[PDB]
Amino acid sequence: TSKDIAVLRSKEWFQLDDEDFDLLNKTLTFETETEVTFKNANIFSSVKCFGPIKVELPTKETVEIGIVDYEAGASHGNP
Amino acid sequence: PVMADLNGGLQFVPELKEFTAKLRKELVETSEVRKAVSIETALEHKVV
Amino acid sequence: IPRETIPFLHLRKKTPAGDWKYDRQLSSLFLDGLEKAAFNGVTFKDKYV
Known part of the structure; x- marks a missing residue:
């Protein structure tokens, strides 16, 4: 659909090298790594979530398009 | 005999079919998305 | 074909x-x-009607 690429572009950690890209009938892969500093067993104190965002080609040979960069504090989970 | 055209002019605005299909096919998007965004953002707000 | 005609x-x-x-x-x-259909005629080959 096209209402999904918007909620995506609605995002702040879903940034790319070029928003121009076409995001329909495309398949994306998210090889993300998370770092976190706690202050309790559940209540985080700092959260990093980075990692590339890759796309299927007609060959399905994934390729890099954009980057995730989520930063946060006092979280209770990972969005 | 006579005929009364009580149409406001909707025989001029042409290719009305999709002219109309659009006017609403926009609302659904501009509407549905904000049913999706509003919830995930609220959802987002619920994990942190 | 004349004009207005x-x-x-x-x-x-x-x-x-x-x-x-x-x-x-x-x-x-x-x-x-x-006129083509008249000096030479039309074909309807391969039609299905």
């Missing part, structure tokens, strides 16, 4: 208004096929 065999064409009026060009080649 409609033949006996014309096709038509629509306006954004809602009507159908005599084109000339459009209705001018229906006839070359005919």
Whole structure:
């Protein structure tokens, strides 16, 4: 659909090298790594979530398009 | 005999079919998305 | 085909208004096929009707 690429572009950690890209009938892969500093067993104190965002080609040979960069504090989970 | 055209002019605005299909096919998007965004953002707000 | 002058065999064409009026060009080649259809004739091969 096209209402999904918007909620995506609605995002702040879903940034790319070029928003121009076409995001329909495309398949994306998210090889993300998370770092976190706690202050309790559940209540985080700092959260990093980075990692590339890759796309299927007609060959399905994934390729890099954009980057995730989520930063946060006092979280209770990972969005 | 006579005929009364009580149409406001909707025989001029042409290719009305999709002219109309659009006017609403926009609302659904501009509407549905904000049913999706509003919830995930609220959802987002619920994990942190 | 003279000007202002409609033949006996014309096709038509629509306006954004809602009507159908005599084109000339459009209705001018229906006839070359005919004159063609008359000195040489048309085929209907491979049709299915």
